[PDB]
Design an enzyme around this catalytic site. Structure first.
Site, PDB file in Angstrom:
ATOM      1  N   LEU A  22       8.477  -4.161   9.125  1.00  0.00           N
ATOM      2  CA  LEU A  22       9.192  -2.897   9.345  1.00  0.00           C
ATOM      3  C   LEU A  22      10.615  -3.106   9.808  1.00  0.00           C
ATOM      4  O   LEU A  22      10.857  -4.146  10.454  1.00  0.00           O
ATOM      5  CB  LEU A  22       8.483  -2.045  10.405  1.00  0.00           C
ATOM      6  CG  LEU A  22       7.075  -1.650   9.992  1.00  0.00           C
ATOM      7  CD1 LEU A  22       6.302  -1.056  11.191  1.00  0.00           C
ATOM      8  CD2 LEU A  22       7.077  -0.665   8.838  1.00  0.00           C
ATOM      9  N   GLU A  30       3.399   6.476  15.929  1.00  0.00           N
ATOM     10  CA  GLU A  30       3.645   6.727  14.498  1.00  0.00           C
ATOM     11  C   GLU A  30       2.517   6.138  13.659  1.00  0.00           C
ATOM     12  O   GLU A  30       2.051   6.775  12.710  1.00  0.00           O
ATOM     13  CB  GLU A  30       4.995   6.164  14.104  1.00  0.00           C
ATOM     14  CG  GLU A  30       5.626   6.905  12.936  1.00  0.00           C
ATOM     15  CD  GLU A  30       5.086   6.592  11.589  1.00  0.00           C
ATOM     16  OE1 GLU A  30       4.903   7.594  10.783  1.00  0.00           O
ATOM     17  OE2 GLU A  30       4.794   5.401  11.279  1.00  0.00           O
TER      18      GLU A  30
HETATM   19  N1  LIG Z   1       8.114   2.301   6.555  1.00  0.00           N
HETATM   20  C1  LIG Z   1       6.950   2.567   5.835  1.00  0.00           C
HETATM   21  O1  LIG Z   1       6.445   3.643   5.660  1.00  0.00           O
HETATM   22  C2  LIG Z   1       6.460   1.345   5.092  1.00  0.00           C
HETATM   23  C3  LIG Z   1       7.023   0.144   5.183  1.00  0.00           C
HETATM   24  N2  LIG Z   1       6.553  -0.983   4.476  1.00  0.00           N
HETATM   25  C4  LIG Z   1       7.408  -2.154   4.577  1.00  0.00           C
HETATM   26  O2  LIG Z   1       8.026  -2.203   3.188  1.00  0.00           O
HETATM   27  C5  LIG Z   1       7.903  -3.549   2.697  1.00  0.00           C
HETATM   28  C6  LIG Z   1       6.752  -3.764   1.668  1.00  0.00           C
HETATM   29  O3  LIG Z   1       7.273  -2.936   0.625  1.00  0.00           O
HETATM   30  P1  LIG Z   1       7.898  -3.540  -0.810  1.00  0.00           P
HETATM   31  O4  LIG Z   1       8.638  -4.585  -0.559  1.00  0.00           O
HETATM   32  O5  LIG Z   1       8.404  -2.265  -1.492  1.00  0.00           O
HETATM   33  O6  LIG Z   1       6.469  -3.847  -1.504  1.00  0.00           O
HETATM   34  P2  LIG Z   1       5.065  -3.465  -2.142  1.00  0.00           P
HETATM   35  O7  LIG Z   1       4.019  -3.170  -1.124  1.00  0.00           O
HETATM   36  O8  LIG Z   1       5.220  -2.425  -3.142  1.00  0.00           O
HETATM   37  O9  LIG Z   1       4.662  -4.794  -2.797  1.00  0.00           O
HETATM   38  C7  LIG Z   1       5.373  -5.261  -4.061  1.00  0.00           C
HETATM   39  C8  LIG Z   1       4.305  -6.071  -4.833  1.00  0.00           C
HETATM   40  O10 LIG Z   1       2.992  -5.310  -5.155  1.00  0.00           O
HETATM   41  C9  LIG Z   1       2.869  -5.250  -6.558  1.00  0.00           C
HETATM   42  N3  LIG Z   1       3.335  -3.929  -6.926  1.00  0.00           N
HETATM   43  C10 LIG Z   1       4.053  -3.059  -6.122  1.00  0.00           C
HETATM   44  N4  LIG Z   1       4.154  -1.921  -6.746  1.00  0.00           N
HETATM   45  C11 LIG Z   1       3.401  -1.969  -7.909  1.00  0.00           C
HETATM   46  C12 LIG Z   1       3.107  -1.061  -8.947  1.00  0.00           C
HETATM   47  N5  LIG Z   1       3.598   0.188  -8.991  1.00  0.00           N
HETATM   48  N6  LIG Z   1       2.277  -1.473  -9.941  1.00  0.00           N
HETATM   49  C13 LIG Z   1       1.810  -2.740  -9.904  1.00  0.00           C
HETATM   50  N7  LIG Z   1       1.999  -3.674  -8.956  1.00  0.00           N
HETATM   51  C14 LIG Z   1       2.826  -3.224  -8.008  1.00  0.00           C
HETATM   52  C15 LIG Z   1       3.581  -6.480  -7.093  1.00  0.00           C
HETATM   53  O11 LIG Z   1       2.828  -7.676  -6.645  1.00  0.00           O
HETATM   54  P3  LIG Z   1       2.767  -8.860  -7.656  1.00  0.00           P
HETATM   55  O12 LIG Z   1       4.079  -9.647  -7.643  1.00  0.00           O
HETATM   56  O13 LIG Z   1       1.607  -9.607  -7.237  1.00  0.00           O
HETATM   57  O14 LIG Z   1       2.675  -8.224  -9.051  1.00  0.00           O
HETATM   58  C16 LIG Z   1       4.907  -6.318  -6.305  1.00  0.00           C
HETATM   59  O15 LIG Z   1       5.681  -7.563  -6.226  1.00  0.00           O
HETATM   60  C17 LIG Z   1       7.509  -4.446   3.893  1.00  0.00           C
HETATM   61  O16 LIG Z   1       8.762  -4.747   4.494  1.00  0.00           O
HETATM   62  C18 LIG Z   1       6.636  -3.503   4.709  1.00  0.00           C
HETATM   63  O17 LIG Z   1       6.636  -3.963   6.050  1.00  0.00           O
HETATM   64  C19 LIG Z   1       5.523  -0.778   3.508  1.00  0.00           C
HETATM   65  C20 LIG Z   1       4.917   0.398   3.375  1.00  0.00           C
HETATM   66  C21 LIG Z   1       5.424   1.763   3.928  1.00  0.00           C
HETATM   67  C1  LIG Z   2       2.898  -4.027  12.367  1.00  0.00           C
HETATM   68  O1  LIG Z   2       2.027  -2.971  12.657  1.00  0.00           O
HETATM   69  C2  LIG Z   2       1.581  -2.129  11.676  1.00  0.00           C
HETATM   70  C3  LIG Z   2       0.539  -1.228  11.806  1.00  0.00           C
HETATM   71  C4  LIG Z   2       0.148  -0.406  10.746  1.00  0.00           C
HETATM   72  C5  LIG Z   2       0.814  -0.485   9.549  1.00  0.00           C
HETATM   73  O2  LIG Z   2       0.526   0.265   8.439  1.00  0.00           O
HETATM   74  C6  LIG Z   2      -0.207   1.433   8.806  1.00  0.00           C
HETATM   75  C7  LIG Z   2       1.864  -1.384   9.391  1.00  0.00           C
HETATM   76  C8  LIG Z   2       2.646  -1.532   8.092  1.00  0.00           C
HETATM   77  C9  LIG Z   2       3.226  -0.610   7.266  1.00  0.00           C
HETATM   78  C10 LIG Z   2       3.290   0.904   7.530  1.00  0.00           C
HETATM   79  C11 LIG Z   2       3.835   1.263   8.899  1.00  0.00           C
HETATM   80  N1  LIG Z   2       4.086   2.547   9.188  1.00  0.00           N
HETATM   81  C12 LIG Z   2       3.829   3.488   8.258  1.00  0.00           C
HETATM   82  N2  LIG Z   2       4.049   4.824   8.660  1.00  0.00           N
HETATM   83  C13 LIG Z   2       3.885   5.812   7.783  1.00  0.00           C
HETATM   84  N3  LIG Z   2       4.075   7.051   8.199  1.00  0.00           N
HETATM   85  N4  LIG Z   2       3.546   5.593   6.514  1.00  0.00           N
HETATM   86  C14 LIG Z   2       3.295   4.346   6.101  1.00  0.00           C
HETATM   87  N5  LIG Z   2       3.001   4.253   4.820  1.00  0.00           N
HETATM   88  C15 LIG Z   2       3.320   3.235   7.003  1.00  0.00           C
HETATM   89  C16 LIG Z   2       2.920   1.852   6.688  1.00  0.00           C
HETATM   90  C17 LIG Z   2       2.081   1.506   5.515  1.00  0.00           C
HETATM   91  C18 LIG Z   2       2.232  -2.193  10.459  1.00  0.00           C
END
Ligand SMILES: NC(=O)C1=CN([C@@H]2O[C@H](COP(=O)(O)OP(=O)(O)OC[C@H]3O[C@@H](n4cnc5c(N)ncnc54)[C@H](OP(=O)(O)O)[C@@H]3O)[C@@H](O)[C@H]2O)C=CC1
Ligand SMILES: COc1ccc(OC)c(/C=C\c2cnc3nc(N)nc(N)c3c2C)c1
Length: 185
Positions: A22, A30
């Site tokens: 993150l 959250e």
């Molecule tokens: N703030 C929030 O709400 C959230 C934050 N995070 C953060 O965001 C980052 C992770 O996100 P990001 O980097 O976008 O990665 P993703 O979780 O989308 O992972 C990317 C990998 O998953 C596969 N992939 C992703 N999307 C698709 C699709 N549509 N169809 C098929 N395969 C797919 C591929 O793996 P392969 O190469 O094996 O094909 C791709 O390289 C981290 O930094 C995480 O901590 C993540 C979720 C929400």
């Molecule tokens: C490091 O600790 C944690 C604990 C729980 C976690 O995922 C639930 C994560 C990673 C990603 C993350 C964090 N926040 C989120 N918030 C909202 N609203 N939506 C999401 N899609 C979120 C996701 C998928 C990291």
């Protein structure tokens, strides 16, 4: 199988991730909101399905994997089996949704939640029909390398409130944030 929903937390600069983590320090409450929204179903016996990319899966602490009380599906085109602890693997969001319609899942799943990352959100936003975006606005800029796409406000409406979602500003570790819900149809 019920509704299709995205849930995200985003910085002011639209950042979601930085170096596979993150952009902000952990905000426990959250996470608790995420947990409640993604786990709760009104239909007894069913579970919600969470769909995520591979980097999002590995960004979740191992003690929290799989996300409890939900069916966990990982998207990857390179893995050939789900990562340890996950329930299902698909190559694309369309294929994951197809799987939800097959007999092994069609009676188990209630809501479908897309939980990241960037590419998965983008694919979900191309799905025709009803879509809600549950967006946590983290009210500060954070250095990021992965971003949430733009929300088209000619297509989506910001709901003035949503049942079960607090309207008031939240704060943890000196970081203010708020919960929003957008809807398109
Ligand atoms: N703030 C929030 O709400 C959230 C934050 N995070 C953060 O965001 C980052 C992770 O996100 P990001 O980097 O976008 O990665 P993703 O979780 O989308 O992972 C990317 C990998 O998953 C596969 N992939 C992703 N999307 C698709 C699709 N549509 N169809 C098929 N395969 C797919 C591929 O793996 P392969 O190469 O094996 O094909 C791709 O390289 C981290 O930094 C995480 O901590 C993540 C979720 C929400
Ligand atoms: C490091 O600790 C944690 C604990 C729980 C976690 O995922 C639930 C994560 C990673 C990603 C993350 C964090 N926040 C989120 N918030 C909202 N609203 N939506 C999401 N899609 C979120 C996701 C998928 C990291």
């Amino acid at each position: 199988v019920g509704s299709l929903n995205c849930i995200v937390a985003v910085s002011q600069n639209m950042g979601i991730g930085k170096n596979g983590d993150l952009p902000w320090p952990p905000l426990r409450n959250e996470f608790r909101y995420f947990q409640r929204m993604t786990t709760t179903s009104s239909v007894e016996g069913k579970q919600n399905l969470v769909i995520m990319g591979k980097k999002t899966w590995f960004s979740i602490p191992e003690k929290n994997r799989p996300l409890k009380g939900r069916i966990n599906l990982v998207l990857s085109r390179e893995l050939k089996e789900p990562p340890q602890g996950a329930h299902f693997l698909s190559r694309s969001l369309d294929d994951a949704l197809k799987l939800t319609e097959q007999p092994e899942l069609a009676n188990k799943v209630d809501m479908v939640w897309i939980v990241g990352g960037s590419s998965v959100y983008k694919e979900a936003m191309n799905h025709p029909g009803h879509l809600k975006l549950f967006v946590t606005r983290i009210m500060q800029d954070f250095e990021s390398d992965t971003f949430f796409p733009e929300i088209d406000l000619e297509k989506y409406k910001l709901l003035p409130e949503y049942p079960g979602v607090l309207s008031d500003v939240q704060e943890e570790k000196g970081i203010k944030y708020k919960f929003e819900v957008y809807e398109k149809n």
